[PDB]
RNA sequence: GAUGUCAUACUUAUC
């Protein structure tokens, strides 16, 4: 099984390892033994479906600070922290018109997501690890 | 005696036709005048090689034959392939027995279909000009595009369905063209949604 | 190998004064590198555009004279 | 200043396809795609040199949301 | 790519 000897479109034999040609069949088998042929041979989804959704009543309180929202949540009995994220109003269930604002929504696993619309462009940061906290001893979330 | 390439380029009115090998010839001015003529043909590139234009496509794959539509519309190629498949399975005794009592009527497709294919169904091939010469890599250089237009392969690779509506048929980068403005490299370029009507210019670009 | 370098015209020192007096080990290699990005970036510092008339141009003064003559 | 580096492209992308993709924002003078001659495959990066630096900067700043074969293509100044 | 000895194969309606 020689991977270099092939048949051309003229009824001959071609060796692509040394780039040689052979007319008859006796010259292709005799071209493997030699110095040039030897030199050429030597050179070469689960967590989303199991999440319970009961949609309880959230308790969010906003306060205009100057240099902050506080959400009171029940005991979740788990290490999963509620995540906050800022999204646009273009994606909705009914797609209502004149929706060109942004909304910061906080979502948890045993509870529903609470969303607050922000008319301003950029007045704060919606990062989870920058200006957010979640006290598990009192079970209260703070977003600044 | 022999001038350099810079003097031959400055003396001749067309310095683009001057080469490095023409400076050491017997007549640089006559060669510069003959190479920069109107109906002149350049020299082939195989005159300075070392393979005589026949040792390049040694191991490269090549098709055996490219049959046209007029020769393939007569059914002679399938009959020839069937005869070659039937003749390759016969042994020496079957080839020696067919020489004394041969079997007539191998194909017998038609008699006037070939004349109608060569006279009425004749198609003109894709010819070329007399100045366009041939080279070794001329059969593989097929890369030799327009602003405002997109091909089917580029639209399939980028995922942009071309339609009559200007909602998704322009690419989503063109909104950046709504942010910064028109490109300075093409002042006469017209894009739909910014400086062209959306139902009128359905080609997603026009060079006016 | 020495025979493949002697038959193809390699192992010959050539000086190119356009791209900072660089060295080239072949006439065909220098002709291939003349229509390249390095020679174009070297010629763009002097203000000469990348055209076909300055293909065989080596010196900076001859290239400047060819750019001023056109 | 007139050359922009385009990265994040797949191996199935070709040089005429990249030229037709780059010609939508401006005429490119040259396009260099470094590829290995041993395997015959691209490296996923290329350099497009235009006729001016402002057109190359506009093509680099206008190709920040281009997606080819599911992969986002990044354009930077070089 | 060149040299020097052997083999294979082809063309010019050669005899």
Q: In the block, which residue shows the tokens 């057109």? A: D55
Measure in Å the smallest separation between the Cα of B184 and chain D Cα atoms: 6
D19 to B145: CB separation less than 8 angstroms, yes or no: yes
**Residue A21 to residue A16: CA distance in whole angstroms:** 9
* A51: nearest Cα among A107, A132, A93, A135: A107
Measure in Å the smallest separation between the Cα of D29 and chain B Cα atoms: 12
Measure in Å the smallest separation between the Cα of B119 and chain C Cα atoms: 48
- This structure's resolution (Å) is 6.1
Report in angstroms the alpha-carbon separations of A24 from A1, A3, A21, B83, B84.
19, 19, 10, 25, 22
Note whether A touches C: 3 CB pairs or more under 8 A: no
Q: Which nucleotide's C1' is closest to B50 (Cα)?
A: E1
Token readout for C55 is 């293909």
CB distance from B180 to chain D under 8 Å?
yes
Q: Which residues contact C57 (CB under 8 A, 6 or more apart)?
A: B5, B6, B9, C18, C63, C66
> Which stretches of D1-78 are assigned E, i.e. beta strand?
3-7, 28-32, 35-36, 41-42, 45-50, 66-68, 71-77
* B29: nearest Cα among B50, B49, B7: B7
The answer to whether the beta carbon of residue A27 comes closer than 7 angstroms to any atom of strand E is yes
Q: Which residues of A touch B58 (CB under 8 A)?
A: 14, 19, 21
The answer to whether the beta carbon of residue B50 comes closer than 7 angstroms to any atom of strand E is yes
Q: Which nucleotide's C1' is closest to A27 (Cα)?
A: E8
Closest chain B residue to the Cα of C52, Cα to Cα: B16
Q: In the block, which residue shows the tokens 């020489």? A: B99
**Which technique was used to obtain these atomic coordinates?**
cryo-EM
* B28: nearest Cα among B51, B58, B62, B5: B5
Longest dimension (CA), chain B: 87
Helices C27-34 and C37-44: angle between axes, nearest 10 degrees:
60
**Residue B64 to residue B72: CA distance in whole angstroms:** 15
């Amino acid at each position: 099984k020689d991977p270099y000897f092939m048949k051309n479109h003229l009824g001959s034999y071609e060796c692509k390892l040394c780039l040689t040609l052979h007319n008859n069949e006796g010259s292709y088998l005799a071209h493997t033994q030699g110095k040039k042929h030897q030199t050429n041979l030597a050179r070469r989804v689960e967590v989303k479906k199991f999440v319970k959704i009961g949609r309880p009543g959230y308790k969010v309180t906003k306060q205009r600070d100057s240099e902050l929202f506080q959400i009171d949540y029940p005991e979740i009995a788990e290490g999963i922290m509620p995540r906050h994220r800022f999204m646009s109003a273009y994606e909705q269930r009914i797609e209502p018109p004149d929706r060109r604002w942004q909304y910061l929504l906080m979502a948890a696993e045993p509870y529903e997501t609470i969303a607050f619309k922000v008319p301003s462009r950029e007045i704060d940061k919606a990062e989870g690890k920058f200006w957010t906290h979640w006290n598990r001893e009192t079970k209260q979330f703070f977003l600044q | 005696n022999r001038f350099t390439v810079a003097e031959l380029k400055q003396l001749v009115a067309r310095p683009d036709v001057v080469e490095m090998h023409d400076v050491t010839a017997q007549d640089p001015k006559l060669l510069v005048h003959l190479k920069a003529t109107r109906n002149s043909v350049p020299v082939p590139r195989h005159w300075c090689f070392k393979r005589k234009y026949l040792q390049g496509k040694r191991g490269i794959e090549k098709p055996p034959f490219e049959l046209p539509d007029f020769i393939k519309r007569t059914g002679i190629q399938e009959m020839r392939e069937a005869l070659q498949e039937k003749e390759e399975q016969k042994t020496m005794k079957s080839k020696m027995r067919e020489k004394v009592r041969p079997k007539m009527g191998k194909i017998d497709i038609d008699y006037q279909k070939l004349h109608d294919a060569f006279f009425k169904w004749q198609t003109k091939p894709k010819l070329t000009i007399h100045g366009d010469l041939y080279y070794e890599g001329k059969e593989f250089e097929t890369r030799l595009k327009k602003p405002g237009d997109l091909s089917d392969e580029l639209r399939i690779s980028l995922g942009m369905p071309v339609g009559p509506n200007a909602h998704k048929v322009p690419p989503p980068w063109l909104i950046a063209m709504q942010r910064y403005g028109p490109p300075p490299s093409y002042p006469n370029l017209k894009i739909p949604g910014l400086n062209s009507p959306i139902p009128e210019s359905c080609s997603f670009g026009y060079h006016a | 190998p020495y025979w493949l370098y002697k038959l193809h015209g390699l192992n010959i020192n050539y000086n190119c004064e356009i791209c900072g007096n660089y060295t080239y080990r072949g006439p065909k290699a220098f002709q291939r590198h003349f229509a390249e990005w390095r020679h174009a970036h070297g010629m763009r510092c002097l203000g000469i555009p990348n055209t076909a008339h300055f293909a065989n141009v080596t010196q900076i003064e001859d290239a400047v004279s060819l750019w001023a003559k056109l | 200043d007139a050359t922009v580096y385009v990265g994040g492209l797949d191996e199935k992308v070709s040089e005429p396809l990249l030229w037709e993709l780059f010609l939508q924002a401006g005429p490119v003078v040259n396009t260099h795609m470094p590829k290995d001659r041993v395997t015959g495959q691209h490296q996923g990066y290329g350099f497009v040199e235009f006729l001016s630096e402002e057109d190359a900067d506009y093509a680099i700043k206008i190709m920040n949301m281009i997606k080819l074969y599911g992969k986002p293509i990044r354009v930077n100044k070089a």
